[PDB]
Design a protein around this ligand. Structure first.
Ligand code: HEM
Ligand SMILES: C=Cc1cccc[n+]1C
Length: 292
């Protein structure tokens, strides 16, 4: 098992990272047209998850630490199709703040997006260090969407996530949309959202879902309201243990926010050893809280 020790960017502190947060947040506000006015929030959340979701608890390969998404093998992963948009968004931020590591930037992009979209505060720790090209994990570590609850449960054990953590994390599927050219799934169109809420769970429970084939000849669940769910999303109401948790989050916005915050921080920190004298996690103020 590889050890990756968090190492604070030299001389940097909370205020430095709040500046980076602010630059990302201001650009999120500025570049509002992206993806039919969804904006870049959802894709940045997905990017933070995909750079983290390569982790394997068994040998500490993959994970957010090394910033390896910057290397061609990983950015060309078919599982990552469309994330180049998030990377391009972050390029000018990195140019302005060249001192931040790639892993810190990609993960901070996700935290910033969640908070700016009115989601929970996500505490965030610095200190990821760029590692060489040969540390890039092979393609195929990110999950398939065409599978069932048993697949989801087993998949997430590799990331050390339990049922509650899985169901909480999946609530991010309130955000943005599927794009046929990226993943072979499509929708929503007009029903897409860039505000972080517990809508995913409400939709699972309340919509009249029909199993249909999309234009890529893949099955997905669609509703008359114009919403969609992936087979893996729908599996959360097919499995009785997942279903109980779906009901809980559908009925308690605050609980969902608290549990998502913990699971998302954990996801972004998997694989990293924080020295006992490392700084405490940072909680960034939103632009709104700063009057900016
Ligand atoms: C079983 C696990 C998961 C599967 C199979 C899955 C699959 C997918 C697929 C196929 C898309 C559409 C990509 C596209 O066409 O652009 C998507 C989008 C997205 N995913 Fe997941 N995902 C999973 C878990 C997660 C998790 C844990 C998060 C974060 C906590 C997340 C965040 C997102 C976001 C925010 C989008 C929207 C991106 C956009 O609008 O551009 N997903 N996911
Ligand atoms: C907004 C819907 C959505 C987006 C991405 C993945 C799954 N879903 C259900």
């Amino acid at each position: 098992t590889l050890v990756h020790v968090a190492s604070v960017e030299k001389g940097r502190s909370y205020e430095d990272f709040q500046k980076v947060y602010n630059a990302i947040a201001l650009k999120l506000r500025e570049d509002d047209e992206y993806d039919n006015y969804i904006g870049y929030g959802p894709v940045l959340v997905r990017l933070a998850w995909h750079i983290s979701g390569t982790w394997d608890k068994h040998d500490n390969t993959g994970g957010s630490y090394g910033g390896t998404y910057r290397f061609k093998k990983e950015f060309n992963d078919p599982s990552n199709a469309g994330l180049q948009n998030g990377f391009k968004f972050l390029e000018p931020i990195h140019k302005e703040f060249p001192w931040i590591s790639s892993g810190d930037l990609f993960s901070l992009g996700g935290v910033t997006a969640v908070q700016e979209m009115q989601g929970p505060k996500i505490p965030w720790r610095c200190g990821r260090v760029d590692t060489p090209e040969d540390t890039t994990p092979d393609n195929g570590r990110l999950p398939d969407a065409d599978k069932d609850a048993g697949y989801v449960r087993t998949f997430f054990q590799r990331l050390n996530m339990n049922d509650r953590e899985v169901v909480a994390l999946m609530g991010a599927h309130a955000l943005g949309k599927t794009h046929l050219k990226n993943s072979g799934y499509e929708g929503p169109g007009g029903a897409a959202n860039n505000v972080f809420t517990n809508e995913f769970y409400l939709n699972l429970l309340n919509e009249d879902w029909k199993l249909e084939k999309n234009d890529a000849n893949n099955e997905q669940w669609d509703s008359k309201s114009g919403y969609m769910m992936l087979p893996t999303d729908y599996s959360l109401i097919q499995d009785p243990k997942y279903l109980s948790i779906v009901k809980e989050y559908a009925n308690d916005q605050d609980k969902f926010f608290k549990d998502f915050s913990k699971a998302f921080e954990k996801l972004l920190e998997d694989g990293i050893t924080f020295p006992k004298d490392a700084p405490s996690p940072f909680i960034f103020k939103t632009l709104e809280e700063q009057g900016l």
